[PDB]
Amino acid sequence: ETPPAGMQYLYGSGEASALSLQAYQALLAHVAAKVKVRPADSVILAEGAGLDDPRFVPCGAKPLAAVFDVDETVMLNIGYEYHAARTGRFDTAAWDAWERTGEAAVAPVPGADRMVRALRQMGVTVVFNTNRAAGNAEPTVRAIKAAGLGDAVHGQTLFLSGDDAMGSRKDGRRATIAARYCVIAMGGDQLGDFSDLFNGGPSVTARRAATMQPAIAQMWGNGWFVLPNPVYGSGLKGGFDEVFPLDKRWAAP
Amino acid sequence: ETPPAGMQYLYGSGEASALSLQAYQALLAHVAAKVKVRPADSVILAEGAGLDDPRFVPCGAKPLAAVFDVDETVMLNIGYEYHAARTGRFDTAAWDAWERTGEAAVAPVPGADRMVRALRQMGVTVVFNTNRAAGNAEPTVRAIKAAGLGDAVHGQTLFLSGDDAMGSRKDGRRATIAARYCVIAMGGDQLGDFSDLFNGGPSVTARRAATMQPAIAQMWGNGWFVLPNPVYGSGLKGGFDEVFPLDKRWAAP
Ligand SMILES: [Mg+2]
Ligand SMILES: [Mg+2]
């Protein structure tokens, strides 16, 4: 009669709350310095830049902005994950219904409503880039509002799956955002919220090593801001040999 | 044939690696400012200060230090958790054996070995406060060393369960550390690594609310630094009514 451990941690624990408040505290102080001293590089990778040699879209004189994934980055999908725990169901038809009717069972990630208000008081535009469907743009706007995250506008501050022909790949939308804003901070909970190059090929152990590539490792808490998600997605993969390296194994007596 | 989801995330994913590098990046920049401008308050709560009215031990002119929990804060216990996933076993006799023989199956939390080296290059003493047993101080010293975390000394930079008569409660050891150092940063993965007042009474929902108390919320990423642990401990508690609030519930059609 107890929910899955990952949901206990993410939705129930003070540990996960404190972890989330830490990320937004670091984001806010990073944005503050970039508002006082505008950078030369934005936080979005340039097209053609690989994970083995990263390079970024220039900041120029474009208006300052911050980009956020929606689900489990700024908004907790409590209603849907409650259904998953009750049912045991990955059901795409249930999630499509959730995208349309879930606006009254969402909550802000701890500190996300304060963080969004402070960014707008600093003159920084808040842009959402999410893989919710374009056809559900309006209920998504209402759910973001009910979570205390402000007013999103499709095509200006809200970009959805199907706005282009790239599907779940977010690089296209990131390039569109970077072409009109100078993004000084980007938040996410899965690595695809920072670059599609983490996905569509690399193995579980390769993706983990890629985060420690020196030009990439410098971004974490310093441009790229991460929130916890041990409940679903690209972080919950791999067999025994990819989770526990063979030189670090041990047996009880 | 796949490990538990929480271990997939924590030990296998790039998401958890990036989350950990973000915490240490924020810690390093926080310590840098406190070395340039010594604060008046240390980061350890004073005795008698409650979570409803926090107050801290003064910094004074004491040497600067940073305090870390060991397990899943700076050191990953890969060997033991591999055994848990293989077995399904919470076995105190197996963990006691792990405390004595696990020095060759540990790894640093991503960024922890670099973070520890940088702190010592800045002149900041690295102090470990862990609930491993006092009688296992020497194999614990060797495991910390094999994880690339430097040289710990029992009673000077390493404080263990049983060093006083308080058991798993860490407040006593924190007061001893704060009496001789000015702790400018403290890292942990469970709330008991910051104050015993989060435990020994408060419910799952109360502990989560306590992290958002205003004087407490300001500490996260700004003195108190958190690392992820969805595998075991005080973050994996609660029934359905404590994980999913009743005003945020939803049912698929
Ligand atoms: Mg997400
Ligand atoms: Mg720990």
C-alpha torsion sign, points B97, B99, B101, B102: positive
Kindly report the nearest CA distance between residue B164 and chain A, in angstroms. 26
Kindly report the nearest CA distance between residue B159 and chain A, in angstroms. 23
A5-228 fold: Rossmann fold (3.40.50)
Number of neighbouring beta carbons within 10 Å of residue A217: 19
DSSP label of B220: B
Q: Among all chains, which residue has been given the structure tokens 């003493």?
A: B125
A83 contacts on B by Cβ (under 8 Å): 250-252
User: How many residues in total does chain B contain?
Assistant: 253
Please check whether the domain covering B5-229 is classified as CATH 3.40.50.1000: yes
d(CA B5, CA B19): 17
Do B212 and A110 lie within an 8 Å CB cutoff?
Answer: yes
C-alpha torsion sign, points B172, B176, B177, B183: positive
In the chain, the amino acid numbered B113 is D
For residue B220 the two structure tokens come to 């996260």
C-alpha torsion sign, points B93, B99, B100, B104: positive
Chain A interface includes B243 (CB < 8 A): yes
Inter-residue contact A149 to A24 (CB < 8 Å): no
Among B201, B228, B183, B189, residue whose Cα is nearest residue B65: B183
Kindly report the nearest CA distance between residue B39 and chain A, in angstroms. 18
Report the relative pairing of strands A75-76 and A107-108 from DSSP bridges. Answer: antiparallel
CB half-sphere exposure, B133, CA atoms < 13 A? 10
d(CA B10, CA B71): 13
State which residue of chain A sits closest to B5, comparing Cα positions.
A236
Method: X-ray
A239 contacts on B by Cβ (under 8 Å): 1-3
Q: Is B133 exposed, middle or buried (0-12, 13-18, 19+ CB in 10 A)?
A: middle
Report the relative pairing of strands A56-58 and A41-45 from DSSP bridges. Answer: antiparallel
C-alpha torsion sign, points A117, A106, A44, A230: positive
Q: Among all chains, which residue has been given the structure tokens 């208006």?
A: A63
Chain A interface includes B21 (CB < 8 A): yes
What's the longest Cα–Cα distance across chain B? 64
Q: How many CB pairs under 8 A join A and B?
A: 276
Among B90, B227, B91, B99, residue whose Cα is nearest residue B161: B99
d(CA B62, CA B34): 13
Nearest bound ligand to the CA of residue B194? 2
B98 contacts on A by Cβ (under 8 Å): 250, 252
- In chain B, count H helices and then E strands: 10, 9
Kindly report the nearest CA distance between residue B109 and chain A, in angstroms. 12
Give the burial string for A93-105 (b: 16+ CB within 10 Å, else e): ebbebbbbbbbeb
CB-closest option in A22, A23, A249 to B82: A249
